Write an enzyme that holds these catalytic residues in place. Structure first.
Site, mmCIF file in Angstrom:
data_model
loop_
_atom_site.group_PDB
_atom_site.id
_atom_site.type_symbol
_atom_site.label_atom_id
_atom_site.label_comp_id
_atom_site.label_asym_id
_atom_site.label_seq_id
_atom_site.Cartn_x
_atom_site.Cartn_y
_atom_site.Cartn_z
ATOM 1 N N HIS A 46 0.824 -1.215 0.000
ATOM 2 C CA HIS A 46 0.000 0.000 0.000
ATOM 3 C C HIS A 46 0.860 1.268 0.000
ATOM 4 O O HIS A 46 0.486 2.286 -0.591
ATOM 5 C CB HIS A 46 -0.983 0.004 1.182
ATOM 6 C CG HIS A 46 -2.193 -0.872 0.981
ATOM 7 N ND1 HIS A 46 -3.472 -0.441 1.243
ATOM 8 C CD2 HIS A 46 -2.308 -2.149 0.548
ATOM 9 C CE1 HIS A 46 -4.328 -1.413 0.989
ATOM 10 N NE2 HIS A 46 -3.648 -2.465 0.563
ATOM 11 N N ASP A 198 3.455 -20.870 0.165
ATOM 12 C CA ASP A 198 3.440 -21.946 -0.815
ATOM 13 C C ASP A 198 2.512 -21.593 -1.971
ATOM 14 O O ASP A 198 2.001 -20.474 -2.034
ATOM 15 C CB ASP A 198 3.024 -23.276 -0.159
ATOM 16 C CG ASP A 198 1.652 -23.214 0.522
ATOM 17 O OD1 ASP A 198 0.912 -22.221 0.341
ATOM 18 O OD2 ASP A 198 1.310 -24.173 1.247
HETATM 19 CA CA CA Z 1 -0.286 -20.481 1.917
HETATM 20 CA CA CA Z 2 3.650 6.008 -0.353
#
Ligand code: CA
Ligand code: CA
Ligand code: HEM
Ligand SMILES: *[C@@H]1O[C@H](CO)[C@@H](O[C@@H]2O[C@H](CO)[C@@H](O)[C@H](O)[C@H]2NC(C)=O)[C@H](O)[C@H]1NC(C)=O
Length: 357
Positions: A46, A198
């Protein structure tokens, strides 16, 4: 160089990150791929993605620590719902390890958090990002209800990411859970192994949906193949965006290409993260401190498996040009509950600090 703890590092400037890594592990991660780790990993994304080529520098500075530097701005955009907790957890370290910029801190913390997840690659880490920037504009964060076209355009505009790199980054959903999508339930995992980096997520999104782990009317959510939950062990949740990327003609084969391909997935993710981590900077002006990133936990080496109660007949394939691998199915008549805690327990609150966000 040689750091005050005798550690021989590449560059002296990288020495400060050593004590920071240990502080993060002891204080908020406890060497586990748990709740706090997951939240920090998301913040890395973000913070970085908030940048736009077309709109220009005024729209945002990318991997600049803006989330930490302007806590009352971005964290409050609806698309950043839930990010407040991770921002508040990291601010104390910014204040303590004051030779390290907010931007560097965010990226490094992500690299550290990931190393706690078995199967994860040892991320490249460059340092030197400035400690000053601007608050980013709203609308630069991709949302679960977005169309594939919209998602791909956003990533392209952010830093020229190709569809392959985009899907590569989504490997992080293998160690991800949702708290805000459905307000009646918390910690709904995206795959049956939320504590393991995974390829289960790629396999499980391709299964037929049979129900919802909580309410059935949530924006950005579609039917899940493993909805069953009990107590704190919440059932699996499926995002519209993940489902859409797994079936779109542009990304279908790339998505399937990661199923049961642990090394390929990990390497591809490392490459994509290499680019994401430096958005808003010229990599030729940053110092390489990769040697200071903790060595990641090894996986067991076992291949992907169909979780109990599901099988090959439940697959909704979309890539016409590649053979789906033959995988085994874990025994059992009904769905197994996905553990809420990494140690199997059902009680494991992560450390959380109060702060400005
Ligand atoms: Ca996983
Ligand atoms: Ca930023
Ligand atoms: C393709 C666009 C993406 C969309 C639409 C998306 C959407 C979401 C949503 C809705 C959640 C649940 C948040 C909540 O309600 O608590 C989530 C969680 C998460 N995502 Fe993404 N995501 C995207 C890309 C990525 C990327 C590139 C990363 C890479 C670091 C990432 C890492 C995470 C992590 C680690 C979590 C889980 C956080 C936790 O367990 O508390 N996501 N994402
Ligand atoms: C980066 O900027 C932040 C924001 O101003 C600095 O944070 C302050 O750091 C001091 C200690 O040096 C703390 O007493 C303040 O409380 C911090 N301010 C806030 C709002 O938390 C940080 O020091 C700067 N770091 C660098 C390397 O320049």
């Amino acid at each position: 160089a040689v750091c005050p703890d005798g550690t021989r590092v590449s560059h002296a400037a990288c020495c400060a990150f050593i004590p920071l890594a240990q502080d993060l592990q002891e204080t908020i991660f406890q060497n586990e791929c748990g709740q706090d780790a997951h939240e920090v990993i998301r913040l890395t994304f973000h913070d970085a993605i908030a940048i736009s080529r077309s709109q220009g520098p005024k729209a945002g500075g990318g991997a600049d620590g803006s989330m930490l530097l302007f806590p009352t701005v971005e964290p409050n955009f609806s698309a950043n719902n839930g990010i407040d907790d991770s921002v508040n957890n990291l601010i104390p370290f910014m204040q303590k390890h004051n030779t390290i910029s907010a931007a560097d801190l965010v990226q490094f913390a992500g690299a550290v958090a990931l190393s706690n997840c078995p199967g994860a690659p040892r991320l490249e880490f460059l340092a030197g990002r400035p400690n000053k920037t601007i608050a980013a504009v709203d609308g630069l964060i991709p949302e679960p209800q977005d169309s594939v076209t919209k998602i791909l355009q956003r990533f392209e505009d952010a830093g020229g990411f190709t569809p392959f790199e985009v899907v590569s980054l989504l490997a992080s959903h293998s160690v991800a859970r949702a708290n805000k999508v459905d307000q009646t339930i918390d910690a709904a995992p995206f795959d049956s192994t939320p504590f393991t980096f995974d390829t289960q997520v790629f396999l499980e999104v391709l299964l037929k949906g049979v129900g919802f782990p909580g309410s059935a009317n949530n924006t950005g959510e579609v039917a899940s193949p493993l909805p069953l939950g009990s107590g704190s062990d919440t059932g699996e949740m499926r995002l519209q965006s993940d489902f859409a990327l797994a079936h779109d003609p542009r990304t279908a084969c790339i998505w399937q290409g990661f199923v049961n391909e642990q090394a390929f997935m990990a390497a591809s993710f490392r490459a994509a993260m290499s680019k994401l981590a430096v958005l808003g900077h010229n990599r030729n002006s940053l110092i390489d401190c990769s040697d200071v990133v903790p060595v990641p936990k090894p996986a067991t080496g076992q291949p992907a498996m169909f979780p109990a109660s599901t099988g090959p007949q439940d697959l909704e394939l979309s890539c016409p040009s590649e053979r789906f691998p033959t995988l085994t199915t874990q025994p059992g008549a009904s769905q197994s509950l996905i553990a809420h805690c990494p140690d199997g327990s059902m009680s494991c609150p992560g450390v959380q600090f109060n702060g400005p966000a």
